[PDB]
Amino acid sequence: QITTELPGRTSAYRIAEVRPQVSGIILKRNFKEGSDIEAGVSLYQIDPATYQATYDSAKGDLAKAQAAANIAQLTVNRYQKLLGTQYISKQEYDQALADAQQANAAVTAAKAAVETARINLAYTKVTSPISGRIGKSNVTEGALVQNGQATALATVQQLDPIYVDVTQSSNDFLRLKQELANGTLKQENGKAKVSLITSDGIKFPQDGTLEFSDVTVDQTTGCITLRAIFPNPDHTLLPGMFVRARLE
Amino acid sequence: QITTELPGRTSAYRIAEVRPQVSGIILKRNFKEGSDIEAGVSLYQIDPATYQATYDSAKGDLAKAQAAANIAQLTVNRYQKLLGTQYISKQEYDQALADAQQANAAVTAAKAAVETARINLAYTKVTSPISGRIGKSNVTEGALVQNGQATALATVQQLDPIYVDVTQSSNDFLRLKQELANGTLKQENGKAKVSLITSDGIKFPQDGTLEFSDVTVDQTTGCITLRAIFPNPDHTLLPGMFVRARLEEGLNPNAILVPQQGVTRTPRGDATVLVVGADDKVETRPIVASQAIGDKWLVTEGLKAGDRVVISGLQKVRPGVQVKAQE
Amino acid sequence: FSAFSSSRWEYGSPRLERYNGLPSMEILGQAAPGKSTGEAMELMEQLASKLPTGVGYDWTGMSYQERLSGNQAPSLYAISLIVVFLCLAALYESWSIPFSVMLVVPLGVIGALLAATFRGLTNDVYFQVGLLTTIGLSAKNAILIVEFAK
Amino acid sequence: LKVNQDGCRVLLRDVAKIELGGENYDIIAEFNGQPASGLGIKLATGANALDTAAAIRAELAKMEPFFPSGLKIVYPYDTTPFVKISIHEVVKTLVEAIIL
C-alpha cells in the first residue's frame, strides 16, 4: 500500500545557452525575457554597417577577380584557336594559361572573401539556436560584446516534458537496492509512473514518468540522476524546485 | 475584497550602455551631466578630417574611375560602331570591354570607399542610441579614446515608464495558481493595476499597471521575478527602493468570515466550530477553517449566512441543552 | 520564515502541574452540606477504582490534615478519662468512690448539644473547648458537692 | 549533518552508533550468578528505623506487581534482620530474664 516519498530537484527537459558568435556592439533586442522563443527567431541585432562595408568590399573584389579572370580567359580563348601556326606558339599560350591559373587563384581568394563576409554577414544578426522558453537577457543594447566570450546571451528552456534529478546517497542506495532486490519498485524496469508532490502538497494532476535503470552513480556520494522525464503540459513546473515524489 | 501587500523590486524601463564607437581625441562634450538625453543626441566629437578627405578624395577617384571608364566605354561603343568589317580586332573589342570591366570594378571599389568613409564618417559623431535620463559625464574635453576599448562612456534609463520586477515567494505563487484556479480578482488577465505603497508612506498618485503572467523563476531560492511597467511622469522613483504594492480588492465576495471567538482548533490536528441545533440543543460541525482574515476567519466548508452560530454561554452548555438566542 | 517554515495547530495547556514532582491536575471539590468529606473520600476512592493501571491520587488541603488524622481526640478523651479516674482516685483517696462523679461528666454536653441545634451550629474547635468548659465547670462544681459531703 | 550542494546529506549517526548511555560503565556488581540492583537505603540523621523498616517492607509491598518478567526482589544486604532481630533477640532474652 504505496511506498516511500523522497525529494529530488527538477530540471528542464532541455536548455540551450545562447552565446554570441560575432564580436561587436549590441543593437536592438528582438524579444522579451521568459517568453516562448522558437528556433531562428531573431534575438539581438549587431550593427551590420561594418559588415556592410565588409560585404560590399568582398563583392567588389569579387568583381575584380571577375574582371582579371575575364582578361585571362579571353587571352586563352584567343590564343587557343591559332596554335601550331605562325600566329601564336606554345610560349605565349602558356603565358596566357599562367594568367588563367593565377586568375583562378584570384577567384579562389575572391570566393574565400565572399563566403567569409557572407557567413560573418549571417552572424551579424542574433537568432535563436533552438525553440522553447527563454531565460533572461544578460547584456543591454549599445554594448560591445565578443565572439566566443564567456558571457552568454541567454538560455532558453524547453518544457512540455520536464526532468527531475533524483538524489540518493550511497548509504541507502543499498536500501534502494533493497527495494530493487525486492523488485517492488521496479516492474516495467524502464520507466513507470511516480506521483508528484510539490510544495503546497497539492500534487501534479497526473503522476510522472520515472526512469528506473539509469542509476547515475556519483564518484563521491552515489547520488543518482534518474532522469525523471515528467509531463509538464502547463509549461510552468519551474525547473529548480526541490519538490518530492513517492513511488508506486 | 481582500488581496496581499508585499515589497516589490522596482527596475527602470531603459538601461543603456554608452561606449566609444571610434578612436580619436574627444573634442568637446555636446551635452550635459544628469540631463534628459533623447535618442540621437550627438555625443563626443572626434575630428573627421581623415575620413572627410578620404571620403571626398574617394568620390573624386570615383569620378576619375567613371571618367576613364566612361571614355573607354565610349571607345567600346566605337568598336560597336566598327565591328562590321575587318577594321577593329575582336581581341581588341573584348580587350577594351574587359578593360571596361576592370575600370567598373574600380568604380565599385570606389563606391565601397565612399560607402566605408561615409559609415566611419557617421561614426565620427557619436549619437545617443535611445532616450531618457543620463547620469553624469565620465569623459571631459580634450580626452583621448580608442575604438572597441573595454571602458564604457555612460548609461541611460527611462522613468516615465518604469518596471517593477515583483519579488515573490514560491508557494504562494501556487496560491496565485490557486488564483489561476480562481481568476476572479485577476481582471483583464494579462495586466491590471496594483496600488503602490512607497517609502514616504504616501502611495504613488496613480497606482501601477501590473503584469500578471510572467514566469521568471529563481534557480536557487524560487524568488519569483514578475516585471511590471509602471507610470511615473515625475521620474522620481528609482530602480531599487524597495517599495510595497498590493492587488485590487478583491476576489469572490461569498466568504465565510466568522470572528475568532467560536473558532476552535478541535480536536488534535483538527478544527470544528460548535453551532446550536435547530431544537436549541447545540450541534457542532467540523469546518475547514482557512486563513484568519482581520478579526475573523475564512471558512470554506459547509456553512452559510444565517446559520445560528453562537457567542457566549458555551461553557455552561454541552451538546444537549436548549438555548434562548441573544445578540 | 515561510521560505522554510511550515506550521500547524494543536492543543496544549498553559498551566501544567506536578504534585510531589508527579504529573498532577488540580481537582477541587466541595461537598453538599450535611455530608463529610471522608464520605467523599470513600466515594471518589471507590471511583478511583474506575482508573487505569499506574494511577495514583491525593487528598490534601485540610484534607491533608484529616488525611493525617481527622480525630485522635477520642484517644485523648479515653486517656483523659483514665487520668481523671486515677487523679480522683487520689483526691477521693478511695477505691471506685470517684466513679460517681464520672456519671456527671456527660451532664454538661446537654445544652451544648441541644442549644447547638436550636441555634443551629455544629462541631469545631470552639465547640470542643465548649465541651471543655462544660465538663470543667460542671464536674468542678460536683467536686465541690462530693467534697462538702466528703 | 553536512551536505553537498546537491543535498547529498548526512543524517545522524551514519559514522557512529546510537544506544542508551550508561553514564559510566565501570561497576560490575554480581549477586549469585548475575548482577542485580542492590539499593542502599542509608540511615538518615534523625531517622526512626523500626516502623520505617516495616514500611520499607511495605514499600516492597507497594511496588511488587508492576514489574517486568523475571524481575526479582531480595534484601541482599539488610541491617534490619540483624538489628530488628538483635532487639527481638536481645529484648526477648531481656524480658524472659525478667521472668527469671
mmCIF file of N, CA, C and O in Angstrom, chain B residues 235-294:
data_model
loop_
_atom_site.group_PDB
_atom_site.id
_atom_site.type_symbol
_atom_site.label_atom_id
_atom_site.label_comp_id
_atom_site.label_asym_id
_atom_site.label_seq_id
_atom_site.Cartn_x
_atom_site.Cartn_y
_atom_site.Cartn_z
ATOM 1 N N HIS B 235 9.455 61.146 -12.682
ATOM 2 C CA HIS B 235 10.760 60.489 -12.772
ATOM 3 C C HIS B 235 11.485 60.443 -11.437
ATOM 4 O O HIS B 235 12.717 60.455 -11.396
ATOM 5 N N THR B 236 10.743 60.389 -10.338
ATOM 6 C CA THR B 236 11.359 60.430 -9.025
ATOM 7 C C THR B 236 11.673 59.045 -8.488
ATOM 8 O O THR B 236 12.625 58.896 -7.715
ATOM 9 N N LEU B 237 10.901 58.038 -8.877
ATOM 10 C CA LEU B 237 11.124 56.680 -8.402
ATOM 11 C C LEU B 237 12.352 56.105 -9.085
ATOM 12 O O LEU B 237 12.571 56.324 -10.281
ATOM 13 N N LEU B 238 13.112 55.417 -8.366
ATOM 14 C CA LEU B 238 14.359 54.926 -8.902
ATOM 15 C C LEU B 238 14.365 53.403 -8.920
ATOM 16 O O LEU B 238 13.611 52.772 -8.176
ATOM 17 N N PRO B 239 15.177 52.766 -9.772
ATOM 18 C CA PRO B 239 15.264 51.301 -9.721
ATOM 19 C C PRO B 239 15.936 50.797 -8.456
ATOM 20 O O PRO B 239 17.146 50.941 -8.267
ATOM 21 N N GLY B 240 15.133 50.207 -7.579
ATOM 22 C CA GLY B 240 15.597 49.715 -6.300
ATOM 23 C C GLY B 240 15.282 50.652 -5.155
ATOM 24 O O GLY B 240 16.047 51.584 -4.895
ATOM 25 N N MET B 241 14.178 50.420 -4.448
ATOM 26 C CA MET B 241 13.758 51.378 -3.431
ATOM 27 C C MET B 241 13.705 50.833 -2.006
ATOM 28 O O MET B 241 14.290 51.473 -1.126
ATOM 29 N N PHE B 242 13.041 49.706 -1.681
ATOM 30 C CA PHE B 242 12.173 48.795 -2.441
ATOM 31 C C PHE B 242 10.755 48.863 -1.904
ATOM 32 O O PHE B 242 10.493 48.431 -0.786
ATOM 33 N N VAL B 243 9.834 49.383 -2.704
ATOM 34 C CA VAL B 243 8.516 49.744 -2.201
ATOM 35 C C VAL B 243 7.624 48.517 -2.106
ATOM 36 O O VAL B 243 7.966 47.445 -2.615
ATOM 37 N N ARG B 244 6.478 48.671 -1.454
ATOM 38 C CA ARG B 244 5.453 47.642 -1.411
ATOM 39 C C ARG B 244 4.364 47.943 -2.429
ATOM 40 O O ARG B 244 4.352 48.996 -3.069
ATOM 41 N N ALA B 245 3.432 46.999 -2.547
ATOM 42 C CA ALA B 245 2.370 47.040 -3.543
ATOM 43 C C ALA B 245 1.346 45.969 -3.190
ATOM 44 O O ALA B 245 1.659 44.990 -2.507
ATOM 45 N N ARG B 246 0.113 46.164 -3.662
ATOM 46 C CA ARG B 246 -0.909 45.141 -3.474
ATOM 47 C C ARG B 246 -1.953 45.204 -4.575
ATOM 48 O O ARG B 246 -2.239 46.265 -5.133
ATOM 49 N N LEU B 247 -2.562 44.050 -4.825
ATOM 50 C CA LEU B 247 -3.506 43.899 -5.915
ATOM 51 C C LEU B 247 -4.839 44.545 -5.553
ATOM 52 O O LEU B 247 -5.054 45.014 -4.432
ATOM 53 N N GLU B 248 -5.748 44.564 -6.522
ATOM 54 C CA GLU B 248 -7.012 45.258 -6.335
ATOM 55 C C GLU B 248 -8.040 44.337 -5.691
ATOM 56 O O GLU B 248 -8.310 43.235 -6.179
ATOM 57 N N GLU B 249 -8.607 44.802 -4.582
ATOM 58 C CA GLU B 249 -9.514 44.014 -3.762
ATOM 59 C C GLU B 249 -10.922 44.036 -4.339
ATOM 60 O O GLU B 249 -11.474 45.108 -4.600
ATOM 61 N N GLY B 250 -11.510 42.855 -4.537
ATOM 62 C CA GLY B 250 -10.883 41.570 -4.290
ATOM 63 C C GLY B 250 -11.596 40.490 -5.072
ATOM 64 O O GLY B 250 -12.287 40.775 -6.048
ATOM 65 N N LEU B 251 -11.421 39.246 -4.653
ATOM 66 C CA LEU B 251 -11.998 38.097 -5.335
ATOM 67 C C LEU B 251 -13.413 37.853 -4.797
ATOM 68 O O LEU B 251 -14.023 38.761 -4.225
ATOM 69 N N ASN B 252 -13.944 36.647 -5.034
ATOM 70 C CA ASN B 252 -15.360 36.302 -4.882
ATOM 71 C C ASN B 252 -15.950 36.660 -3.521
ATOM 72 O O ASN B 252 -15.450 36.192 -2.492
ATOM 73 N N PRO B 253 -17.040 37.434 -3.484
ATOM 74 C CA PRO B 253 -17.483 38.051 -2.228
ATOM 75 C C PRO B 253 -18.048 37.074 -1.216
ATOM 76 O O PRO B 253 -17.918 37.312 -0.012
ATOM 77 N N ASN B 254 -18.652 35.984 -1.660
ATOM 78 C CA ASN B 254 -19.045 34.907 -0.764
ATOM 79 C C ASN B 254 -17.832 34.302 -0.067
ATOM 80 O O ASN B 254 -16.999 33.643 -0.698
ATOM 81 N N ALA B 255 -17.730 34.542 1.242
ATOM 82 C CA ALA B 255 -16.567 34.103 2.012
ATOM 83 C C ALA B 255 -16.947 34.036 3.482
ATOM 84 O O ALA B 255 -17.149 35.080 4.108
ATOM 85 N N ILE B 256 -16.976 32.826 4.041
ATOM 86 C CA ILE B 256 -17.449 32.618 5.404
ATOM 87 C C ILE B 256 -16.417 33.149 6.384
ATOM 88 O O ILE B 256 -15.406 32.497 6.662
ATOM 89 N N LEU B 257 -16.677 34.336 6.905
ATOM 90 C CA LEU B 257 -15.783 35.060 7.793
ATOM 91 C C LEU B 257 -16.435 35.157 9.163
ATOM 92 O O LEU B 257 -17.202 36.077 9.443
ATOM 93 N N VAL B 258 -16.121 34.197 10.016
ATOM 94 C CA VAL B 258 -16.582 34.236 11.394
ATOM 95 C C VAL B 258 -15.458 34.824 12.238
ATOM 96 O O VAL B 258 -14.281 34.532 11.989
ATOM 97 N N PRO B 259 -15.772 35.699 13.194
ATOM 98 C CA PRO B 259 -14.759 36.163 14.143
ATOM 99 C C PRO B 259 -14.145 35.037 14.954
ATOM 100 O O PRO B 259 -14.652 33.917 15.031
ATOM 101 N N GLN B 260 -13.041 35.387 15.604
ATOM 102 C CA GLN B 260 -12.113 34.421 16.170
ATOM 103 C C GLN B 260 -12.680 33.672 17.365
ATOM 104 O O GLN B 260 -12.068 32.699 17.812
ATOM 105 N N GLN B 261 -13.830 34.097 17.883
ATOM 106 C CA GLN B 261 -14.262 33.664 19.201
ATOM 107 C C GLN B 261 -14.749 32.225 19.208
ATOM 108 O O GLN B 261 -14.275 31.421 20.015
ATOM 109 N N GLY B 262 -15.661 31.869 18.314
ATOM 110 C CA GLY B 262 -16.078 30.485 18.229
ATOM 111 C C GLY B 262 -15.089 29.565 17.560
ATOM 112 O O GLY B 262 -15.304 28.350 17.525
ATOM 113 N N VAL B 263 -14.007 30.126 17.029
ATOM 114 C CA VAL B 263 -13.023 29.363 16.277
ATOM 115 C C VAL B 263 -12.252 28.464 17.229
ATOM 116 O O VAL B 263 -11.563 28.942 18.135
ATOM 117 N N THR B 264 -12.393 27.156 17.048
ATOM 118 C CA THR B 264 -11.753 26.186 17.921
ATOM 119 C C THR B 264 -10.947 25.204 17.087
ATOM 120 O O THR B 264 -11.483 24.562 16.182
ATOM 121 N N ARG B 265 -9.657 25.093 17.394
ATOM 122 C CA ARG B 265 -8.815 24.046 16.817
ATOM 123 C C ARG B 265 -9.120 22.763 17.569
ATOM 124 O O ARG B 265 -8.501 22.442 18.583
ATOM 125 N N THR B 266 -10.074 22.025 17.061
ATOM 126 C CA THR B 266 -10.624 20.922 17.819
ATOM 127 C C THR B 266 -10.951 19.768 16.888
ATOM 128 O O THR B 266 -11.508 19.991 15.812
ATOM 129 N N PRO B 267 -10.549 18.539 17.214
ATOM 130 C CA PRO B 267 -9.518 18.200 18.185
ATOM 131 C C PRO B 267 -8.137 18.377 17.605
ATOM 132 O O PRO B 267 -7.890 19.285 16.812
ATOM 133 N N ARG B 268 -7.228 17.572 18.134
ATOM 134 C CA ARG B 268 -5.846 17.450 17.699
ATOM 135 C C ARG B 268 -5.688 17.360 16.192
ATOM 136 O O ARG B 268 -6.193 16.431 15.555
ATOM 137 N N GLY B 269 -4.989 18.335 15.620
ATOM 138 C CA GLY B 269 -4.821 18.398 14.185
ATOM 139 C C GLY B 269 -6.070 18.774 13.433
ATOM 140 O O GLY B 269 -6.109 18.635 12.210
ATOM 141 N N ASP B 270 -7.095 19.258 14.128
ATOM 142 C CA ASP B 270 -8.425 19.410 13.572
ATOM 143 C C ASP B 270 -8.977 20.758 14.014
ATOM 144 O O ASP B 270 -8.387 21.442 14.851
ATOM 145 N N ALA B 271 -10.131 21.136 13.456
ATOM 146 C CA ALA B 271 -10.750 22.425 13.772
ATOM 147 C C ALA B 271 -12.249 22.334 13.491
ATOM 148 O O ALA B 271 -12.657 22.215 12.334
ATOM 149 N N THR B 272 -13.060 22.396 14.550
ATOM 150 C CA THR B 272 -14.513 22.457 14.417
ATOM 151 C C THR B 272 -15.010 23.775 14.985
ATOM 152 O O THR B 272 -14.296 24.437 15.740
ATOM 153 N N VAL B 273 -16.226 24.155 14.622
ATOM 154 C CA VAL B 273 -16.938 25.186 15.366
ATOM 155 C C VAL B 273 -18.311 24.648 15.758
ATOM 156 O O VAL B 273 -19.000 24.034 14.944
ATOM 157 N N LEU B 274 -18.696 24.859 17.017
ATOM 158 C CA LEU B 274 -19.992 24.429 17.520
ATOM 159 C C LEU B 274 -21.106 25.433 17.247
ATOM 160 O O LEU B 274 -21.058 26.571 17.723
ATOM 161 N N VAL B 275 -22.106 25.016 16.482
ATOM 162 C CA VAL B 275 -23.314 25.774 16.197
ATOM 163 C C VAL B 275 -24.382 25.263 17.162
ATOM 164 O O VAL B 275 -24.223 24.190 17.751
ATOM 165 N N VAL B 276 -25.449 26.024 17.383
ATOM 166 C CA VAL B 276 -26.608 25.481 18.081
ATOM 167 C C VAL B 276 -27.348 24.562 17.115
ATOM 168 O O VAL B 276 -27.182 24.663 15.893
ATOM 169 N N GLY B 277 -28.108 23.617 17.656
ATOM 170 C CA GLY B 277 -29.049 22.866 16.862
ATOM 171 C C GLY B 277 -30.305 23.670 16.603
ATOM 172 O O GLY B 277 -30.545 24.726 17.189
ATOM 173 N N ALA B 278 -31.128 23.142 15.700
ATOM 174 C CA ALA B 278 -32.395 23.785 15.387
ATOM 175 C C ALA B 278 -33.405 23.630 16.510
ATOM 176 O O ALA B 278 -34.299 24.470 16.647
ATOM 177 N N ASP B 279 -33.279 22.578 17.308
ATOM 178 C CA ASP B 279 -34.091 22.408 18.500
ATOM 179 C C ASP B 279 -33.375 22.880 19.748
ATOM 180 O O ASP B 279 -33.571 22.286 20.817
ATOM 181 N N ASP B 280 -32.465 23.845 19.586
ATOM 182 C CA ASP B 280 -31.783 24.620 20.617
ATOM 183 C C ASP B 280 -30.741 23.822 21.387
ATOM 184 O O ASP B 280 -29.951 24.408 22.125
ATOM 185 N N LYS B 281 -30.687 22.513 21.198
ATOM 186 C CA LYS B 281 -29.634 21.715 21.799
ATOM 187 C C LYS B 281 -28.502 21.620 20.797
ATOM 188 O O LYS B 281 -28.722 21.211 19.654
ATOM 189 N N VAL B 282 -27.297 21.989 21.228
ATOM 190 C CA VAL B 282 -26.326 22.519 20.285
ATOM 191 C C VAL B 282 -25.716 21.406 19.443
ATOM 192 O O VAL B 282 -25.820 20.213 19.747
ATOM 193 N N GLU B 283 -25.070 21.822 18.359
ATOM 194 C CA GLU B 283 -24.779 20.936 17.238
ATOM 195 C C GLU B 283 -23.467 21.395 16.605
ATOM 196 O O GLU B 283 -23.452 22.298 15.765
ATOM 197 N N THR B 284 -22.371 20.769 17.014
ATOM 198 C CA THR B 284 -21.083 21.132 16.453
ATOM 199 C C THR B 284 -20.948 20.611 15.035
ATOM 200 O O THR B 284 -21.513 19.576 14.673
ATOM 201 N N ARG B 285 -20.237 21.372 14.212
ATOM 202 C CA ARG B 285 -19.956 20.958 12.850
ATOM 203 C C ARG B 285 -18.482 21.202 12.577
ATOM 204 O O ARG B 285 -17.996 22.335 12.765
ATOM 205 N N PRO B 286 -17.737 20.176 12.181
ATOM 206 C CA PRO B 286 -16.361 20.390 11.731
ATOM 207 C C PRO B 286 -16.342 21.179 10.438
ATOM 208 O O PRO B 286 -17.129 20.922 9.527
ATOM 209 N N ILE B 287 -15.465 22.172 10.382
ATOM 210 C CA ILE B 287 -15.361 23.024 9.211
ATOM 211 C C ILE B 287 -13.899 23.273 8.883
ATOM 212 O O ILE B 287 -13.040 23.370 9.761
ATOM 213 N N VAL B 288 -13.628 23.370 7.591
ATOM 214 C CA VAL B 288 -12.319 23.739 7.087
ATOM 215 C C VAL B 288 -12.184 25.227 7.359
ATOM 216 O O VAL B 288 -12.700 26.063 6.615
ATOM 217 N N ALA B 289 -11.525 25.551 8.458
ATOM 218 C CA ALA B 289 -11.151 26.924 8.712
ATOM 219 C C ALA B 289 -9.922 27.261 7.889
ATOM 220 O O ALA B 289 -8.863 26.649 8.040
ATOM 221 N N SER B 290 -10.070 28.236 7.016
ATOM 222 C CA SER B 290 -8.977 28.705 6.184
ATOM 223 C C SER B 290 -8.208 29.769 6.962
ATOM 224 O O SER B 290 -8.258 29.802 8.191
ATOM 225 N N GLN B 291 -7.426 30.575 6.256
ATOM 226 C CA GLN B 291 -6.671 31.667 6.851
ATOM 227 C C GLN B 291 -7.558 32.641 7.619
ATOM 228 O O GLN B 291 -8.659 32.982 7.183
ATOM 229 N N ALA B 292 -7.078 33.046 8.792
ATOM 230 C CA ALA B 292 -7.679 34.145 9.530
ATOM 231 C C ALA B 292 -7.600 35.425 8.723
ATOM 232 O O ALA B 292 -6.590 35.725 8.085
ATOM 233 N N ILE B 293 -8.688 36.183 8.736
ATOM 234 C CA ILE B 293 -8.786 37.396 7.941
ATOM 235 C C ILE B 293 -9.295 38.496 8.860
ATOM 236 O O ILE B 293 -10.459 38.481 9.273
ATOM 237 N N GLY B 294 -8.428 39.452 9.178
ATOM 238 C CA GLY B 294 -8.826 40.553 10.040
ATOM 239 C C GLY B 294 -9.029 40.052 11.450
ATOM 240 O O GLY B 294 -8.214 39.294 11.986
#
